[PDB]
Design a protein around this ligand. Structure first.
Ligand SMILES: CC(C)(COP(=O)(O)OP(=O)(O)OC[C@H]1O[C@@H](n2cnc3c(N)ncnc32)[C@H](O)[C@H]1OP(=O)(O)O)[C@H](O)C(=O)NCCC(=O)NCCS
Ligand SMILES: CC(C)(COP(=O)(O)OP(=O)(O)OC[C@H]1O[C@@H](n2cnc3c(N)ncnc32)[C@H](O)[C@H]1OP(=O)(O)O)[C@H](O)C(=O)NCCC(=O)NCCS
Ligand SMILES: CC(C)(COP(=O)(O)OP(=O)(O)OC[C@H]1O[C@@H](n2cnc3c(N)ncnc32)[C@H](O)[C@H]1OP(=O)(O)O)[C@H](O)C(=O)NCCC(=O)NCCS
Ligand SMILES: CC(C)(COP(=O)(O)OP(=O)(O)OC[C@H]1O[C@@H](n2cnc3c(N)ncnc32)[C@H](O)[C@H]1OP(=O)(O)O)[C@H](O)C(=O)NCCC(=O)NCCS
Ligand SMILES: CC(C)(COP(=O)(O)OP(=O)(O)OC[C@H]1O[C@@H](n2cnc3c(N)ncnc32)[C@H](O)[C@H]1OP(=O)(O)O)[C@H](O)C(=O)NCCC(=O)NCCS
Ligand SMILES: CC(C)(COP(=O)(O)OP(=O)(O)OC[C@H]1O[C@@H](n2cnc3c(N)ncnc32)[C@H](O)[C@H]1OP(=O)(O)O)[C@H](O)C(=O)NCCC(=O)NCCS
Lengths: 157, 157, 157, 157, 157, 157
């Protein structure tokens, strides 16, 4: 079989993320979404919420699973018995950094990284920006999954 | 009438900023410079000084006013009864980030953002770099307005 | 009054173009779309068709007019009694070239150029690509105005 | 099964190309290299030579086949019963153009495009540059497959 | 001694070029400006004029000489008994292409390429753009050396 | 004589750094590596270790010396009686920032900055990434000098 890992901190998962999950799932036999715990105490949602939110946003993709990532992405990829990372590109991606890590990741573990541009309508949303805009009262509900909108409403109220 | 907002933290306003103010004022009936209070306690000049400095540097532009910005830029723009942001581009601008925010700002409030490249002679000055260079004794007086040079001299001595 | 020129060869005008026309018209008192005749004998549509197509695609914008451009863009801008160019940015824009021409245009004639990112859904269409995709049988009708789709159908059949 | 198409004009196939073929073949059940005939009469090697050269350079990859591409890449991809393009990124790739075509290709046919950075040691070779450097007597043999070096020697002598 | 080559087609040499020549001459014992004959019959000035123009624009730099380049830049560099190329960066430079050629040039001949940003006031001039703007009547005399302005006047009249 | 300064925090010096040192030393009479103490208490290796590591990694370059930098880079350059900075470019370099500082540095002190792309095989290593990858158990020993690998082993154990 063929497999890819979609790594990230998904705090929260946006519809740009989901778009990329959907494309990974159509093109690989299995997809694993690896949720990577923020280095220090820094999140808006705790791990369980992030997992639930990804899970709840991906029920339509039966070949995808959600797991917490630990250590080097490449080590996790290898443990999933895979050799591919799939990363989404959006407006504001630091692509040069992504490239530097792609080359490093290939160097140290032979893992390939495939990049895919997210749909234009979801290309300007990031977890960071969605949070900052929502905290100051802006409406980003069209760019997040409903499971995320539900949890974002509660935590704001 | 037609109107644009030039948002920023102007800590301090440079002559790159002024160049952009000047171009906004020539092309729109009214210009509002929105000074956006640094999120946490982080400035070099307090709000009043920043306002004074912008005011003192823009006496030649009668169709421009200076106001403190609050909340989402787009909310402020709408409150000024305008629908346009004018942002300057210089060497070192994170243009991809600017673009991501431009698309988000259009999405949530229908506000357009116009980008204009600052004059080559003012294209390498930023508030950040002007401060760091001046603190370590370098001469950046040719890239800042005289009202700013006056206040930068005092605070360094 | 305030005014901007939207220059280009509009062979054919796409909905990315129109998006930009719409934004120019909302923010300036008058907009002039300047159709710039291809240097040598190189178009798909002749000048009259290009004019008709822009005209037919902009009936909802009463403050915009369509004129054939001649010579230096800046000379045309000045002749329209304006001092601003408005250019759209899309995926694939040579922005560095646009910037070089913006600085040159300011140098030689004091004309400012404002850049505005086109809507994400129209950000991957260009006249060039729309033509190449349509010639080889692909459907680009969602990214062109109906006046353009009508004329593109006929010329393909 | 899962499948990807690696499109291009491979005139000639370089070791940057092969690097990408190798990565596609490891991650997808079948890979098809689509050789796309230059629009007008413009090649250095004719189609048969290009096919032979790709074939001869990919004998170690049993899950890959070489076919001549016709029309829209996306139409060929669909005909191969696949929905993925795999493209290599190297120094000098026009990535903005690649992105514009990726979004267009997704729009018109639902085909995803995955981008993968070629190995650093093969990242500065292109068919174009390899030809220009070799014609003027430079040694690019370390950056081309041996089947290509053999045919490039003969045609130069 | 230390040495660098400044390669190009200098049709015509601009003041951006001269700025770079000046910086090369201050930092290396000898500088050679290599004028590289356009591949086909394509120039505005013939070789002799280009040489004269560079010569006449560099009389203040006694450690610089002007020579016609032939073949691979790296072959010329080696023949000058040097191992360094100095290239200017301006607005509109295709830097990715410059980088690809820098890596190729190092690969095939061990020649290093140093890049230096041209002065902001000369950063938007190119030979190409200066010619196109001047042909259509624009004034680019502030961005070209006087020897070039003299010859550009005559050829336009 | 001719001279260049290679500034940085070299925490630790990588083989990308050394590649650049080597190229500077071949092209300039003297090279000074300026180690610039991290602003606050933030390093992995203290100054003495950084100096030792650079020293131990550059014994093959007799025309290079290592010194601790203080204040503005340009002030240090001037004190070394030089007027040139040599900076390496790798994947992930913030080149726009480098350019902004190059223009500022030229403005305030007349110091030129030359940029040189590091060898492809060392183009994805940075001090930052090498540390993060090594802390989480990855093998980056092929991208660091042996003096650095020795000290990185000890500090990890
Ligand atoms: C690969 C990696 C870049 C992806 O994880 P990510 O946290 O989702 O980050 P992304 O690149 O996807 O996008 C933005 C990211 O900036 C991250 N970020 C965290 N703190 C940030 C800071 N103070 N400022 C800027 N960005 C920050 C965001 O977390 C992260 O997403 P978000 O900010 O939108 O919430 C991250 O570096 C990582 O992988 N950690 C596991 C590390 C690993 O394997 N390292 C070896 C490196 S080759
Ligand atoms: C739009 C915005 C980017 C412009 O404000 P700005 O503070 O002047 O910042 P700029 O983009 O113009 O230029 C550099 C900026 O980096 C800002 N900055 C502040 N802290 C910084 C950090 N720790 N590191 C990097 N940059 C930082 C600078 O403040 C700011 O200017 P300066 O650093 O030269 O003093 C800023 O994000 C903002 O708008 N705040 C109001 C927010 C809003 O509407 N958000 C919804 C987002 S779509
Ligand atoms: C400003 C200018 C760049 C805009 O006109 P434009 O033709 O619409 O071109 P754009 O930059 O908008 O976008 C793509 C352009 O590439 C143009 N183009 C024409 N021939 C091309 C070639 N052989 N290859 C690449 N692009 C080409 C396209 O015409 C043009 O649009 P299109 O290709 O999608 O049909 C054009 O250079 C111009 O302005 N001519 C008037 C010139 C002037 O004032 N020059 C002084 C220069 S500062
Ligand atoms: C997708 C496509 C960009 C890839 O094919 P490619 O010819 O290998 O080109 P690449 O992007 O891979 O890399 C460089 C390319 O520039 C191409 N090129 C051809 N003529 C060129 C010109 N006069 N100048 C610049 N580049 C040229 C090169 O052929 C090609 O490779 P090469 O130059 O190194 O020999 C090409 O556009 C294509 O796909 N043709 C089939 C088209 C299709 O489906 N079009 C719908 C568009 S969304
Ligand atoms: C290195 C090289 C890029 C520099 O020469 P240059 O002609 O001055 O070109 P530059 O990169 O400096 O800047 C713009 C260039 O585009 C060149 N150019 C020529 N025809 C062009 C075309 N049809 N369209 C786009 N640009 C063109 C310009 O000549 C040239 O300067 P100009 O256009 O402003 O008159 C050129 O490729 C060369 O070096 N020829 C000698 C080649 C060599 O050694 N090749 C081995 C390659 S690694
Ligand atoms: C010129 C300068 C950019 C080079 O020093 P450098 O520390 O080696 O940094 P580099 O640009 O080379 O590369 C990455 C750098 O990010 C630096 N960095 C330090 N803290 C960082 C932060 N919190 N986040 C992002 N990067 C950081 C790194 O130190 C530094 O190298 P490293 O991160 O790989 O350990 C640095 O700004 C400097 O020069 N200090 C002396 C300053 C001076 O003259 N200033 C006047 C400015 S024109």
């Amino acid at each position: 079989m063929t497999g890819a890992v979609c790594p990230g901190s998904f705090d929260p998962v946006t519809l740009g993320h989901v778009d990329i999950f959907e494309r990974a799932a159509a093109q690989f036999d299995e997809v694993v979404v690896a949720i990577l715990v923020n280095p220090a105490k820094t999140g808006m949602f705790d791990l369980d919420e992030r997992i639930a939110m990804v899970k709840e946003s991906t029920t339509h993709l039966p070949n995808l699973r959600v797991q917490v990532g630990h250590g080097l992405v490449v080590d996790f990829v290898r443990s999933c018995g895979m050799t591919a990372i799939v990363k989404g590109l959006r407006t504001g991606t630091d692509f040069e950094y992504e490239l530097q890590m792609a080359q490093m990741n290939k160097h140290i573990a032979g893992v390939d990284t495939f990049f895919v541009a997210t749909a234009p309508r979801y290309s300007f949303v990031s977890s960071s920006l969605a949070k900052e805009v929502a905290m100051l009262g802006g409406d980003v509900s069209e760019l997040l999954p409903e499971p995320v909108n539900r949890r974002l409403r509660d935590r704001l109220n």
